[PDB]
Write an enzyme that holds these catalytic residues in place. Structure first.
Site, PDB file in Angstrom:
ATOM      1  N   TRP A 120       0.803  -1.199   0.000  1.00 10.99           N
ATOM      2  CA  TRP A 120       0.000   0.000   0.000  1.00 10.99           C
ATOM      3  C   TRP A 120       0.877   1.309   0.000  1.00 10.99           C
ATOM      4  O   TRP A 120       1.983   1.359   0.597  1.00 10.99           O
ATOM      5  CB  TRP A 120      -0.855  -0.065   1.231  1.00 10.99           C
ATOM      6  CG  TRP A 120      -1.833   1.023   1.444  1.00 10.99           C
ATOM      7  CD1 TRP A 120      -3.160   1.007   1.104  1.00 10.99           C
ATOM      8  CD2 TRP A 120      -1.605   2.272   2.090  1.00 10.99           C
ATOM      9  NE1 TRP A 120      -3.756   2.160   1.496  1.00 10.99           N
ATOM     10  CE2 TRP A 120      -2.843   2.944   2.137  1.00 10.99           C
ATOM     11  CE3 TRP A 120      -0.481   2.867   2.692  1.00 10.99           C
ATOM     12  CZ2 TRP A 120      -2.999   4.217   2.750  1.00 10.99           C
ATOM     13  CZ3 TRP A 120      -0.628   4.093   3.311  1.00 10.99           C
ATOM     14  CH2 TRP A 120      -1.894   4.774   3.315  1.00 10.99           C
ATOM     15  N   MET A 124       1.144  -5.108   2.667  1.00 14.62           N
ATOM     16  CA  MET A 124      -0.203  -5.657   2.632  1.00 14.62           C
ATOM     17  C   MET A 124      -0.270  -6.774   1.575  1.00 14.62           C
ATOM     18  O   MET A 124      -1.166  -7.669   1.594  1.00 14.62           O
ATOM     19  CB  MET A 124      -1.293  -4.590   2.400  1.00 14.62           C
ATOM     20  CG  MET A 124      -1.371  -4.080   0.916  1.00 14.62           C
ATOM     21  SD  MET A 124      -2.879  -3.205   0.515  1.00 14.62           S
ATOM     22  CE  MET A 124      -4.015  -4.573   0.436  1.00 14.62           C
ATOM     23  N   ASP A 175      11.566  -1.426  10.936  1.00 14.01           N
ATOM     24  CA  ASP A 175      10.325  -1.160  10.153  1.00 14.01           C
ATOM     25  C   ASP A 175       9.319  -0.391  10.973  1.00 14.01           C
ATOM     26  O   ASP A 175       8.816  -0.893  12.005  1.00 14.01           O
ATOM     27  CB  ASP A 175       9.715  -2.446   9.635  1.00 14.01           C
ATOM     28  CG  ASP A 175       8.587  -2.237   8.602  1.00 14.01           C
ATOM     29  OD1 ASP A 175       7.825  -1.260   8.713  1.00 14.01           O
ATOM     30  OD2 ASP A 175       8.467  -3.082   7.665  1.00 14.01           O
TER      31      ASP A 175
END
Lengths: 271, 271, 271
Positions: free
Chosen positions: A28, A95, A222
């Site tokens: 995304w 995603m 992350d």
């Protein structure tokens, strides 16, 4: 190239090169172009590389309905079917880790040689009653609220923590521009529906259905999809899976760690 | 509009107005919009203007294979046939000069009324054993290496010498933005293969096959495609060619010298 | 989605949700994405929303001919017929107010439940011999000359008075980027012809044919389409029309006053 999904959505994809196929599922709110360097790297070393724009993103149609993981897995199934792929390595970023897992859960692995989950939301991203360590749904609720006020500026601001520019990573303005430019192609409705779907969708059952070799890769810096509750657990829950942790890598590590990624993908395909 | 090339590649083009056709072939790494002002100028003055996005660029498909001058020349042939064009004036910019010339070399000029070569890589761009004055292949090898690291930022920095802004040309931010926006639409792969094709393809034999009126226009401040070893030599190698040298003009002179170029294209068509 | 207009032009559109239909007509030089927040807001509250990219803009084809209001109005009729829409509420912004009114004028209102005119050019924008209070033709002649020199920079500079950033409105850099990116998608030819069209088309006769409930909304800080000679007059000339004035609002009020427009459009549809 394009194919038409069951509900009539035209989905754009690239299909480059020849040999055994590797099919890529973007994160995304990007599109097939986030893979262009992995694709050039692998197709110019004897693999066939395929990558689509998820419904609602990039050059694909923007349907109001079907912006959910079961539809996304089934969209993948139609692509594989359309091209009659066999022994495909499935590679999913962020995603896009979820719809490649959910393709395997819903359709089996008869066509699949291997799975790579890159900075992926699997096995579960947001909180559940037995997963309080997940991300609270209120966090995603606020993201949706800001997306529904100004998605352009939200994505432009997303560049820094995506790429870890706020933590010392170095990513050109050029790459930041292209990231925003691709994101703007996307549907507002798909952009927001995907937050719902990745916040709430539980892929722990899909983990048990994965019976192919599997490489999980995650950066432990992350900021967007936390390693400890996603990639680390996905490696443990997938029987036989291998894990590589890129030290201090950010979420956008297909950019910041492109060479390392390319080589790891090549090594995996040649195991 | 689109047409489908023999290998299945869908290629976008615009076809404006009516009258004798003028068919435009863009340079790297752009698309048919680099011609929009020449097209508007000529089609308001009774010509039909056609411009396509080369395969791998703009709104066209991005095939892995066929990113080479013979395939480019053949695309142009299929466009000309698809529309049944006659007495076409071929106009090529930069790498686009090679595929209109290769079109004539491979198919003859029965359909062609005249040829315009703008800032063009013809007759030969990179070095050959008998042409050490060309650009060393090394130079292109390094461009390729950088494009395979960060093509976004590469093309962004390319605006400055392209347009001569690094030497004082004044070009708006809007032009520079639109330039990168269009570039980013292209395939990484097509973007990289075109460098190989324009660095290494020899169009000297094609020059002997051009038997139609030809105008060569070149800026003599061209930092990308040097005047002395390209346009200067194309004008001498093509029987009856006329040469115009735009004094201090950069490579991107269809922007910096747009009015001058429109008037020259109009005067050439009317000769 | 796409349909094909009488002359062969393919027109892109979005058709979201289900329910009573609301059909949106964008302003210059934008595309269907300018409505994405109204669309999401109404489609998730029980309305079907439809918005197209005008010929020459966005993802639609760029024909040389037909860039005029009668054709724009017939494009809208073909869309309505293609989808077999009934009881449609037509919503037009800025120049988009003109083709929805012209659609009623040419086709009748049998299919139409209502009309909303937002910052619209109706009933007349430029001067006529009986309307010197219009904007002088010279002003649009000069815009055209600038667009025909550098439309990229001209639209970039247009961001400020469009959004009223020069009068203290606050609009993110992300929205200004998106606005420019969408603008660059369009044809140079369509972008210039639409100025001619909205400068010179008289919609006063159309005002007398509007026999459906009508809401006119305008900002009285609009620097692009002057409230006093457009929206204020349109509301008076259309029988039964309701008028709302957004105090100090700019032209770009679908962005700066998004939530208020949403609520007003919902309230109108429920009346």
């Amino acid at each position: 190239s394009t194919f038409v999904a069951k509900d009539g959505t035209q989905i754009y994809f690239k299909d480059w090169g020849s040999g055994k196929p590797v099919l890529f599922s973007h994160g995304w709110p990007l599109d097939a172009d986030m893979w262009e360097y992995q694709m050039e790297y692998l197709s110019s070393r004897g693999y066939r590389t395929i990558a689509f724009d998820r419904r609602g993103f990039g050059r694909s149609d923007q349907p109001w309905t079907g912006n959910d993981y079961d539809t996304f897995a089934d969209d993948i199934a139609q692509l594989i079917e359309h091209l009659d792929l066999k022994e495909v390595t499935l590679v999913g970023f962020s995603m896009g880790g979820g719809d490649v897992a959910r393709y395997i859960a819903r359709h089996g692995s008869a066509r699949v040689a291997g799975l790579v989950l890159l900075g992926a939301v699997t096995p579960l991203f947001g909180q559940k009653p037995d997963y309080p360590q997940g991300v609270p749904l209120d966090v995603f609720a606020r993201f949706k609220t800001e997306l529904l006020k100004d998605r352009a500026q939200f994505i432009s601001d997303f560049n820094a923590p995506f790429y870890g520019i706020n933590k010392g990573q170095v990513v050109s303005q050029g790459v930041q521009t292209q990231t925003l430019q691709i994101a703007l192609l996307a549907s507002l409705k798909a952009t927001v529906d995907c937050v719902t779907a990745f916040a709430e969708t539980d892929f722990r059952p899909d983990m048990a259905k994965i019976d192919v070799p599997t490489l999980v890769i995650h950066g432990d810096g992350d900021q967007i999809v936390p390693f400890e509750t996603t990639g680390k657990v996905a490696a443990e829950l997938i029987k036989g899976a291998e894990l590589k942790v890129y030290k201090d890598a950010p979420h956008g590590f297909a950019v910041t760690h492109a060479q390392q990624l390319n080589e790891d993908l090549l090594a995996f395909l040649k195991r």
